[PDB]
Amino acid sequence: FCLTLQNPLRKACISIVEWKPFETIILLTIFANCVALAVYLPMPEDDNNSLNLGLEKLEYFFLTVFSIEAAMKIIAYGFLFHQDAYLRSGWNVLDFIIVFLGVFTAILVKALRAFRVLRPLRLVSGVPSLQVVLNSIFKAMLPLFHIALLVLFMVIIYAIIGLELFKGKMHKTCYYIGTDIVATVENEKPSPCARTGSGRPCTINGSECRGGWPGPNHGITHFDNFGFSMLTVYQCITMEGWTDVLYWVNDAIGNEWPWIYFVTLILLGSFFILNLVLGVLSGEFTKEREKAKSRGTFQKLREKQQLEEDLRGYMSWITQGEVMNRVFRWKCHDLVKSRVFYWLVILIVALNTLSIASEHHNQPLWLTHLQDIANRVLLSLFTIEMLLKMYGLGLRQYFMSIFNRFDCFVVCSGILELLLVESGAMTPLGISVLRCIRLLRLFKITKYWTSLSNLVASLLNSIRSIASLLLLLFLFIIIFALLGMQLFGGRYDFEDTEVRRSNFDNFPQALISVFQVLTGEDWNSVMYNGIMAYGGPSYPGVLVCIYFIILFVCGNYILLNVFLAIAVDNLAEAESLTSAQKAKAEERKRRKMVRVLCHRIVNATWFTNFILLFILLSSAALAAEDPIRAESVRNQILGYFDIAFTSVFTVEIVLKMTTYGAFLHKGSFCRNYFNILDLLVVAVSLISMGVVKILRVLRVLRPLRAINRAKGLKHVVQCVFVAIRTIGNIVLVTTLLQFMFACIGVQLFKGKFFSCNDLSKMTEEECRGYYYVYKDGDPTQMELRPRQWIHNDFHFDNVLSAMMSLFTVSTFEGWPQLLYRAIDSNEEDMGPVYNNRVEMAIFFIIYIILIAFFMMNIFVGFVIVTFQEQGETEYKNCELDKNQRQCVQYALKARPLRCYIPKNPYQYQVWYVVTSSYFEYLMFALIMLNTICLGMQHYHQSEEMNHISDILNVAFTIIFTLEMILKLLAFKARGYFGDPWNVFDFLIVIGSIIDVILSEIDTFRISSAFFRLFRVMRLIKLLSRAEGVRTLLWTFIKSFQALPYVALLIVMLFFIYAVIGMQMFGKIALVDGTQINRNNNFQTFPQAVLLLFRCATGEAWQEILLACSYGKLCDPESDYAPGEEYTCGTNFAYYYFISFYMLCAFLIINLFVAVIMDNFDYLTRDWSILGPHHLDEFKAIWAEYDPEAKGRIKHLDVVTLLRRIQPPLGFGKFCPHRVACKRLVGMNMPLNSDGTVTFNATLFALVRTALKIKTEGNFEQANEELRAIIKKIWKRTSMKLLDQVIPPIGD
Amino acid sequence: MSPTEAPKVRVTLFCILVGIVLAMTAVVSDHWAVLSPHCEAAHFGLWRICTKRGEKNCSYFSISAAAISVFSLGFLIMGTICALMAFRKKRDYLLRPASMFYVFAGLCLFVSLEVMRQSVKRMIEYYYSWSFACACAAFVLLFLGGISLLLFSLPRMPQNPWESCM
Ligand SMILES: *[C@@H]1O[C@H](CO)[C@@H](O)[C@H](O)[C@H]1NC(C)=O
Ligand SMILES: [Ca+2]
């Protein structure tokens, strides 16, 4: 609006604005101002040191500047040029700080101090090219509100189910006798208890359950109170702390009857990324081929690279030629390029690796000097192959290879370190850094890997992009970190003895803590401490939980757009790899220029299922077992079966054996079928005639052979078995980087991580005897323990031991239990110091982002492979690339719709109401009232609220019944039971009326809880009418039908890994709080799956590996008769869980990449040419004018149909005056009887408008040419009506 | 036709007709569990509690367990009606509500299973008996037997989006 438009010398200030140096000034204005928020040190109960006093006055200086800068621009530009959001928001920052002065000096407010955190966002308006990069994001999130609207409706479903079934179970105590102490055991979180049957016993020797609140963390996960069940469901979906909830419910109610609930939560919580991994990959793959393929920048980019090879290629010959005079100088390529050095320098490097894969923290006397002679020996030889490479190769070309540009910097770092320590006059800090520089010599293997030669190009393409991307990420962290220092301000005081250690009470402490929430590790402890800090779970205090939701949702998604741009890069790395395998092959193309009866047994269906069942019964015999009884009846009945199940299997072997002779063993499958029975022989023989475990383990090899006819190996993982030699490099790439950072870890963290149990002694000699453990910090409640070194169980001593610990960080699990332990390292063998050495955190964060960058890579390799599997059948196309193939699928196949209209005009008057949508909104309303009728159930409430609560549940049940009645009156059940949505509510209605009657009988009990779910289920009627999201699920329902056998692989893991673990990891006595207990048990089978299922979402498998080592108590009902008491646990747990987390997580990605193979077609539908809704719409127009289901429309009403479709597919608004007639004149429309034309002829004529055409002669040849294409696509030779459809569509 | 004439709706119907009589057997059967005080050993029943030391003595006293099971037979009565009519007029669609009632009837027996389990904890040994395993087998055959009949009644999601829900 540009207020009052005055010229005279404002123009000077206008010309002042257009000067370039405002980039030079004001960029440094922000960057100074963020440092002004860095060292702002918050102090808890109104305290200021000196620096906070000063910079409050310096906050006046920063407010002084922008108050000059902005109102000058209104005089410069005015309000027609503040239409910029970056000018619209920038001012909103400036406006509030001036208001903050006005309030601060009128009183001479607190929340008025935290709006000033937004000042880093002034960088965006200043710095160019970032305004694009944010708009990479906000135009990528918009294809997700059909996916985010699912979880929000799925939470509202899973919150109300929890609030009905679990209302107020968490309240009973485990207190002592008459006092007010909760009774726990040293490590245990105080779990609920119950004094009736079927739950906890509460056997802590001197206790009794009562009322009150011992419930979870500090009051946070009641299943009271709608507003809280929305929290704990949201805690479980992101999969960090859900098994804590399940142990709270199972200890409160009883097991075997909630685990149904939480598993269906996570299988629709693990399903949900499989929406959104591919939901975000949709537009990404689209933008890679609908921005740049519409542009053609890729040919421009690979041309300049092709010239870059010609520049480097032909310059070297000029470089070689003009200088070239010795009997040597050809002894170069005699030696250097020869095959001898390629198998000789590798030896020294592999010796320079095993010069480092020493380093104990003890190193007795040998390796102390043997590594010192190695730096003299191995560096010498290495120098030789430099100096031969320097002189007799060519000096300029040796500095032309980047890979040999690295070798000088090694051999510079080889000698200059070496000549320094000959002096010695230096700090032992300094020589400690120099030993870290010796780990550059591992990077000689990075010049290997031919696979890296595009993985180098994976990086060097994107440095223009991702460094602008990781500027935006590091911005997003510093925004939320400085917000955290104001919302939480070091309010973590508490007055207790527990170390709530992830406080925000610094800047770089807040930075590390904030990062933890992004990785999703342990953000309970962060959040639980946030809400406990303010007052309690309350009305004001609990609302700050949305700082940690928004940090976890908005934070995670921009991390996903980082992923997004990386997948584009390997697609460019695909094309530089694929097209190079054309052009490299084409250069050589220029350089080319009654045993017979037993076969009836092996074929029979009387034999086919009969060997399936004895697998399925041999499975179940392995399923339910004793394994800690040693003599019981279970062992002896099930012992009888598997000997007999060998016997039926034995005839299966012999009847197979007489079929084929010497050429029977040509199958490796056939070799596998035989060695099982051989092992079985001695399994059965040694028992019946007097370590015998291996005979029992290998019975589960029999259920392997079930997938004999399953091609889910032969299609899906065979596609990965193509890329398994590509990912055989890629997994061995990261394992090299898990190797090399282990050696950086060992050079830093030897001997440390070594902590006493009495935290004040720090040293070996000074830490024994006894000491005083205070239960809660009253200095009277004083207890004893012996003290000793707790060597902290994931230690960095040997490089074997290191990689087992960098693995736990790589699964993002317990890295804060390791980082906070890692900071406290002290001298070589000394206990921890509280916040010594804060700088060691940069080691884990660079390590994290490194592997978490690499993680994304492993996933990107998959999706590229998947697309290129679909292409191989599409290369005999001759079509519009699946656009025309869609129209082949639609214009041929699709019949009419169902379209029911009655007679008997009493019945019609019902029918006129039903399809008329005046009451479709009404059921929409009364569902939403039955949300809040179920969404106000507080706890303890009253008898006022109860009397309302029964009455409405009766009244709503009547209305849906009268709905059901009137729908049944018009649509008599042949009509009514056509739609499954009509069927499903009929399941609800009877299920609701029993909920009315069972409520009468208790007015006069488990289904009094259990049938209450039927009020919840009627919310799912909402998805009947939300078209945007109904087809999205429909797509993935159509998917999981198509891939059963891949999901049948993962359950072969759980089945096999349990029965292995069930016979090894029994006998492991179930002491509470030691992470293997009554709820995390190995003993029965079904426990086993949940413990395995706890690993698959990664809920702290860190701990449970440590609970099976060698020193666990042996469950005092089993064995071990004197003395040998603690010896039931083996070191095979290491190779168990580690291989389990690999082969599980891996197999699940093979599931998630497999769902691409169906639904890529859905993900990249052009919503600007012709999608499915249009072709879905056309089926519904027949439901208007052809309600007799004839499949034929008269020629007259064609015209009124073509005006009413929609313009983008049908005809526009200016209609028609010839055009929507002349188009039909310009097409193939036959006439059948009277005047009635079929649908498919009308369907095909309109669809040729979109999939464009030519005139007759070209159409008449197309009537064979599409008939040439479709007869191929008609895989069945039958159906001459399809050819009859082909002439009638051609007519 | 082929909904009715697939044998998979004939296999799953007959094994429901197993559990229908099995549930009907657990209607009358008074041997849910054994009273064992240590004699007045007795049997908790849906209708009458019979006590034996042969000096056998039937009596009664726990009330809603019969009445909840009264609806359970009443579904099975009503669930045979539309299922029998679903054969003889080529009316296919009545397999749907016949499957509906067969779902709920085993569900109400589960209620009485908990209600009789509730009668144990109120109180002398209680051991479960053969009529308990009558119902817990009758539960599964009416629950899992119904839904497979229900889902095979409903057509497919067919494979490919040009036919949906007809
Ligand atoms: C705790 O348990 C032990 C072993 O049963 C017993 O000696 C001791 O008296 C118990 N304490 C109490 C208070 O009952
Ligand atoms: Ca975790």
Ligand SMILES: [Ca+2]
């Ligand atoms: Ca995790």
